[PDB]
Amino acid sequence: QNQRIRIRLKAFDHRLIDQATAEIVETAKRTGAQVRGPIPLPTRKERFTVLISPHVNDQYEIRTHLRLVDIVEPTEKTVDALMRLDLAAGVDVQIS
């Protein structure tokens, strides 16, 4: 069943990704197995510029966090729910 399962989890907004993490914990606990994580990462800022006109003579810090989910004993219902769910637009649910 490819039992060695790695998940990294990106977070721009912490509330939306905590909601998605609670949904992952729910859809992992309602199928039989037990889930581990997140063990979160500290503040990893980004280097992203804006499209603004230059001055003739915004944002700089993007607080992104990472979360870790390890699965070692899955079921077929667990991976089915991981292949029959829906998510919010713009966030990553990448099962590494």
Binding site: E23, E26, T27, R30, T31, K77, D80, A81, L82, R84, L85, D86, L87
Partner: protein
């Protein structure tokens, strides 16, 4: 700041027409779509969870079993009928003959 529409500059080309005609006249009466013919369907979606649809998708397995049952029963009946109606006679041949003949009629053509 684009304003790169053909109909906009064509209306601006005929601005003298809408300047001459709209002297003590209204400008436009254009109705839009109304929310009466739109079901909002927003009574309750809190038990309509995404993970609960993940554990429980829709199902028509019983439909496939029923359709396979209909196909198998019909195939058995039609195989039996095409087995005992187009059989092969043995060592002697067709023991009768068809003899069918069709005559003519007097058919008018109004």
């Amino acid at each position: 700041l684009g304003s790169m529409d053909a109909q906009t500059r064509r209306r601006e080309r005929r601005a003298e027409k809408q300047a001459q005609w709209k002297a003590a006249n209204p400008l436009l009466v254009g109705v839009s779509a109304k929310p009466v013919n739109r079901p909002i369907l927003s009574l309750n979606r809190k038990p309509k969870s995404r993970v609960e649809s993940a554990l429980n998708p829709i199902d028509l397995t019983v439909l496939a079993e029923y359709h396979k049952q209909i196909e198998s029963n019909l195939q058995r009946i039609e195989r039996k009928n095409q087995r005992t109606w187009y059989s092969k006679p043995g060592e002697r041949g067709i023991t009768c003959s068809g003899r069918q003949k069709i005559k003519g009629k007097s058919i008018p053509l109004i």
